Amino acid sequence: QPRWASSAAGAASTPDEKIVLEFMDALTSNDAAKLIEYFAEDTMFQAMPLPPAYGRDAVEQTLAGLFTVMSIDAVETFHIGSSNGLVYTERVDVLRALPTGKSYNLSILGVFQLTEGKITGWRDYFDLREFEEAVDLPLR
Amino acid sequence: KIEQPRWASKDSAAGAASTPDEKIVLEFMDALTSNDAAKLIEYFAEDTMFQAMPLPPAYGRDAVEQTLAGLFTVMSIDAVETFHIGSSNGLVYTERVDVLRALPTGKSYNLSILGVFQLTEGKITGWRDYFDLREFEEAVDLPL
Ligand SMILES: NCCC1(c2ccccc2)COC1
Ligand SMILES: NCCC1(c2ccccc2)COC1
Numbered sequence A: 001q002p003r004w005a006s007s008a009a010g011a012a013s014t015p016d017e018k019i020v021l022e023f024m025d026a027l028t029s030n031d032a033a034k035l036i037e038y039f040a041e042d043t044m045f046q047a048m049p050l051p052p053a054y055g056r057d058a059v060e061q062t063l064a065g066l067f068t069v070m071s072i073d074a075v076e077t078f079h080i081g082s083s084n085g086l087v088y089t090e091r092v093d094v095l096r097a098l099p100t101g102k103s104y105n106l107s108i109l110g111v112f113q114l115t116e117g118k119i120t121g122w123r124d125y126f127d128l129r130e131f132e133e134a135v136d137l138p139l140r
Numbered sequence B: 001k002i003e004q005p006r007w008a009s010k011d012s013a014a015g016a017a018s019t020p021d022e023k024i025v026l027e028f029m030d031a032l033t034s035n036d037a038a039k040l041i042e043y044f045a046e047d048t049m050f051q052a053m054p055l056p057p058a059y060g061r062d063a064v065e066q067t068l069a070g071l072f073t074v075m076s077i078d079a080v081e082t083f084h085i086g087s088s089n090g091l092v093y094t095e096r097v098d099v100l101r102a103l104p105t106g107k108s109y110n111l112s113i114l115g116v117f118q119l120t121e122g123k124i125t126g127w128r129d130y131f132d133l134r135e136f137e138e139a140v141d142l143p144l
């Protein structure tokens, strides 16, 4: 739990913020076929250290690939807010490398674009090397 | 001036500062290009922190100033291009690219960043930038 955590900062206060929180909970399913139901047809996803994926088919394939070697065991959201149809989440994802069994608390700032309650864009910003060295698994 | 990302929101409001706090942050982003820690620190409260998230945090105004000064001895911020800015609950979020030049190696890199700023009574109580450090290091041939 970060020293720098802000009162309503951690509350989801709009429908879009609430759907993003629900999506963060669904991520622990590690199930890309289930998670793709949250995305619009016109959509994209990027873990920013890695190449982007555009459209539902490429996004589902990208997520499925990540889930073959890592489990999202928990998502803890410290701050959530929104302006202009974008939702921002400052969080830690607890990521477990399946090959090694090691876990790591990865600090993430992510952004979600939503239209009519569906994700039109999801980008997470973080440092990939610190995750790789912690769990003994390169990902690039 | 940087190419607009394919994923950038077309809603004009998404890229504009719409609140007093967001306007402070946009001015602060312009000030980054002066590469002067003493100029930047005037925007910070005494109860404050800074962290480039791949690197250790600094707490308090003096430690923040010294960390900023130390970063500016090794890199220059030549431009900042903000694509999205938004805010809730006293926090401002900026999705942007910082054009970062490594002074020892004379190479530059367009670093994709999502950053968060906490403001209290118009002063920065926290500033954390999230990005991948390794891709910057490899682009400019500067380990750390
Ligand atoms: N940041 C986007 C990638 C993350 C992920 C997604 C699917 C499977 C594993 C890991 C979410 O935080 C790591
Ligand atoms: N990411 C946070 C650190 C940055 C910086 C700040 C001051 C001096 C040099 C570099 C902002 O983008 C790089």
Ligand code: NA
Pocket: A008, A009, A010, A011, A012, A013, A079, A080, A081, B088, B089
């Ligand atoms: Na909030």
Ligand code: NA
Pocket: A081, A082, A083, A084, B086, B087, B088
């Ligand atoms: Na807002």
Ligand code: NA
Pocket: A083, A084, B013, B014, B015, B016, B017, B018, B084, B085, B086
């Ligand atoms: Na905006």
